[PDB]
Write a protein that binds this ligand. Structure first.
Ligand SMILES: [Mg+2]
Ligand SMILES: [Mg+2]
Ligand SMILES: [Mg+2]
Ligand SMILES: [Mg+2]
Ligand SMILES: [Mg+2]
Ligand SMILES: [Mg+2]
Ligand SMILES: [Mg+2]
Ligand SMILES: [Mg+2]
Ligand SMILES: [Mg+2]
Ligand SMILES: [Mg+2]
Ligand SMILES: [Zn+2]
Lengths: 100, 106, 107, 50, 62, 131
RNA sequence: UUCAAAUGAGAACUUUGAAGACUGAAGUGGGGAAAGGUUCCACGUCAACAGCAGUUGGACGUGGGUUAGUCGAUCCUAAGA
RNA sequence: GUGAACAGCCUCUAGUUGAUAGAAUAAUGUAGAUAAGGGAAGUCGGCAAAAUAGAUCCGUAACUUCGGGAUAAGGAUUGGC
């Protein structure tokens, strides 16, 4: 186990070329937390309760924007030159219709 | 000169979630704090106590919060909690153990 | 057919005599050819952690033996020209010596 | 140069305003023979020579 | 997506080199929406963009 | 194989062997002959100022003194301490002429050894006095 | 130089992340003078050009951008005209 | 950091990873090395290579415009603790 841990740490670390990312800035997943604590042999009842409470707190509620504009797009004629609404088009302002 | 400094650690969140042992943490501190360069030489110099949620270290011989953090991170690495639990300061000489940010699985 | 095995690959004899700037890229190609030979799949994907294991000691420091986990799985995309592909993972072990081909029980 | 004279900057402004392709409505006129800008200038092709 | 502009803006806003900014590879659309230094600051605040630590040059052997 | 070792240990650039130097130092007559050498025009220092341990001629007595106050000379003197390692040692290690090797070892331990040590001590004090 | 993902009809060459390297402060870093004149930046975007390629570009199309009593010119005189 | 040192070599901040690619390893080339014994017998010609090299100490000829020649030549040594 000690040799395996040495090999895993050697594969993880690349300290000569750059630093390791800060854990306090990264975020990780409850699945990995559960599997690691299960390997360590602790009791996951309280952590599972916390995760279930967080999941039940994060509820997705649909709205009128989701009902109306949920699948659609555009609503605006996309310009040929990527111009804003009040931006001049030197090339195409003199030709009103798209056929011409 | 030799004014007694007090350092507190709050282990309540990992203890309540059931992944930490304050008695083992305090015993590790007792066995691994070095005075004048050696372990087991804490007699009448430093004292470590724990009541199940707060671990208190009262020292008169060259103890610092950075040293306490170093020892706590050694203990967390030994118990394989370094990737999930960190040691942070709330005010001067009072610290707590916190979890790293974890997203729900859903 | 979905399957997963663990193999040992001898990169020493495959990289024998290769120019120093090309050793790690040739190890990548030899691993792809190895997976194709053992699984019958033209589509082979190497994990980035496996790429790290290959390149860990620079361009000319490839290990003699590597322990690999090769998984033949189904290609979900319809536009793909093949229905199956292989995924090659590194197995970090104490030593890559004395190990035989084994079948990993997927669960 | 960054510290340029006003005369040079005036000629530069004129060159910038001249740098364009043809307007498209020119091509639709009766008996039009102008089919491209034959005097177009680019910074990396022909130097203005002051 | 092309996040070259966002990478440059993140380096300028954080105040480090472009070699020291990490853009989350999973929040590609969210980073692509950010066209201003204000939005870049918001992304840094919520953790989509992270400042890397300096590569160590220890003096122990010296 | 490499150029440094090749051009140092070429056969034409070979040096005197340690067992030969040990035989030279073992007998008092040999030490006296090596200390009193005839004047040779082809030698450094006209054949004088000769270090017996290193088997080396010096151009001057001051050069010989600086050589004696050095680690190279100390290295050679330390090398010249024990059994000279002739072919009989390798034969005994292989299991051949073991009794002959044992007789040679006990002769070195009893008679040749201390006489060589006393000759070395007399040579050292002579060199210290004259230099 | 390598790996995975994204984008895309199409990716050795584009973007992000993961790795391996290099310039090694007399730099492959950060600014300026002469010179250039918009090449700066954004959006759109691949016919021609980038001696392979190309979704990329100092390319093509449309716009945005240079704020001074204190920084310069302006003033003074030099060789000289 | 090493080192007398803006030398060479390695590294931090910052910046690059650009120069058509892939597969094999015949002859002949371009660039770079090693070689037993002999040691210029080679060649118009020691061309080219090899050998020397930092630092400490000992020592240093002819000639001379007395200032030099001179690092003349020739020797001993160098690590770690
Ligand atoms: Mg070869
Ligand atoms: Mg270099
Ligand atoms: Mg370097
Ligand atoms: Mg081309
Ligand atoms: Mg540009
Ligand atoms: Mg343009
Ligand atoms: Mg030879
Ligand atoms: Mg001849
Ligand atoms: Mg001849
Ligand atoms: Mg001379
Ligand atoms: Zn000697």
């Amino acid at each position: 186990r000690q040799k395996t841990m040495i090999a895993e740490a050697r594969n993880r670390k690349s300290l000569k070329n750059k630093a390791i990312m800060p854990r306090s800035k990264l975020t990780k997943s409850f699945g990995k937390m559960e599997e690691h604590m299960s390997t360590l042999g602790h009791d996951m009842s309280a952590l599972q309760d916390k995760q279930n409470r967080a999941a039940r707190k994060n509820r997705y509620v649909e709205r009128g924007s989701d009902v109306v504009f949920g699948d659609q797009d555009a609503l605006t004629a996309s310009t040929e030159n990527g111009v804003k609404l009040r931006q001049t088009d030197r090339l195409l302002d003199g030709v009103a219709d798209g056929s011409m | 000169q030799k004014i007694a400094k007090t350092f507190t650690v709050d282990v309540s969140s990992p203890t309540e979630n059931g992944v930490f042992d304050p008695a083992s943490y305090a015993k590790y501190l007792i066995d691994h704090i070095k005075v004048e360069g050696a372990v087991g030489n804490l007699g009448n110099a430093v004292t470590v106590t724990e009541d199940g949620t707060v671990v208190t270290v009262v020292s008169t011989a060259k103890f610092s919060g950075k040293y306490l953090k170093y020892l706590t991170k050694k203990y967390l690495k030994k118990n394989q909690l370094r990737d999930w639990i960190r040691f942070v300061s709330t005010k001067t000489n009072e610290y707590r153990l916190a979890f790293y940010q974890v997203t729900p699985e859903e | 057919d979905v399957v997963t095995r663990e193999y040992t690959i001898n990169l020493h004899k495959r990289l024998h005599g290769v120019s120093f700037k090309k050793r790690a890229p040739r190890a990548v190609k030899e691993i792809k050819k190895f997976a194709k030979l053992h699984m019958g799949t033209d589509d082979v994907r190497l994990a980035p952690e496996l790429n790290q294991a290959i390149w860990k000691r620079g361009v000319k420091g490839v290990e003699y033996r590597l322990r690999l986990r090769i998984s033949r799985k189904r290609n979900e995309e319809e536009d793909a020209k093949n229905p199956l592909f292989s995924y090659v993972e590194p197995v970090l072990v104490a030593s890559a010596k004395g190990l035989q081909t084994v079948v990993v029980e997927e669960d | 140069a960054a510290q340029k004279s006003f005369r040079i900057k005036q000629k530069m402004a004129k060159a910038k305003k001249q740098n364009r392709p043809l307007p498209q409505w020119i091509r639709l006129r009766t008996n039009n023979t102008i089919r491209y800008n034959a005097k177009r200038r680019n910074w990396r092709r022909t130097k203005m020579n002051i | 997506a092309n996040l070259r502009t966002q990478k440059r803006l993140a380096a300028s806003v954080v105040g480090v080199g472009k070699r020291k900014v990490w853009l989350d590879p999973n929040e590609t659309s969210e980073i692509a929406q950010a066209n201003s230094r204000n939005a870049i600051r918001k992304l840094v605040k919520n953790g989509t963009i992270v400042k890397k630590a300096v590569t160590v040059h220890s003096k122990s052997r010296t | 194989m490499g150029r440094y070792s090749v051009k140092r240990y070429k056969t034409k650039r070979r040096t005197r062997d340690l067992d030969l130097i040990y035989n030279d130092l073992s007998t008092k007559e040999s030490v006296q002959k090596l200390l009193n050498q005839p004047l040779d025009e082809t030698k450094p220092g006209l054949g004088q100022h000769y270090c017996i341990h290193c088997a080396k001629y010096m151009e001057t007595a001051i050069a010989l003194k600086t050589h004696l106050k050095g680690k190279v000379h100390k290295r050679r003197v330390k090398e010249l301490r024990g059994v000279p390692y002739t072919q009989e040692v390798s034969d005994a290690a292989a299991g051949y002429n073991l009794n002959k090797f044992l007789n040679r070892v006990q002769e070195i331990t009893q008679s040749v050894g201390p006489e060589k040590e006393s000759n070395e001590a007399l040579l050292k004090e002579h060199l210290d006095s004259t230099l």
